[PDB]
Structure formats: C-alpha cells, structure tokens
C-alpha cells in the first residue's frame, strides 16, 4: 500500500494512497499555517475539491 505526499499550491500538501498500483485514494490534505488561516483552508477545499480529485486521479464518489 504505497502512500505519498504531493506538493499542490504553496502551503498545500496532499496525501494519496494506492495498493500495488491500483485505484488511488485521497487520505488527507495538510495546510501550512504559514499560508492558511482556518477560514482560508475551509474556503480552499470548497474551491479546489473537484480539481484535486481530477488532477490526482481519485474517483470522486
């Protein structure tokens, strides 16, 4: 079960998983407090959720 982190926008780090090169899953998104307030991080997720699922090839169930 591979698990890794991708650099997204500055201050946004996305953890993905896959088993043996199978379908990918989105495990978590980490936001730097250097770059994000809690209000900003919530708004970011609303604005970027669809792009994150498409770009990183995670089925948006």
């Amino acid at each position: 079960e591979k698990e890794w982190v991708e650099q997204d926008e500055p201050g946004v780090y996305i953890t993905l998983t896959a088993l043996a090169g199978g379908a990918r899953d989105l495990k978590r998104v980490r936001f730097s407090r250097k770059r994000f307030s809690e209000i900003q991080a919530e708004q970011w997720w609303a604005d970027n959720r669809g792009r994150v699922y498409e770009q990183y090839n995670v089925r948006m169930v």
């Binding site: 989105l26 495990k27 978590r28 980490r30 936001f31 730097s32």
Partner: peptide, 16 residues
Amino acid sequence: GPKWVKTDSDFIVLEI
C-alpha cells in the same frame, strides 16, 4: 468526515 483537525501549531489537517 471529512474532519478538520486544528490541534497542531504548524498545520491544519483535513482528514478525508
């Protein structure tokens, strides 16, 4: 959840 975790001083975490 997704659930927000706000206890860390360096990061906010959205646990999917």
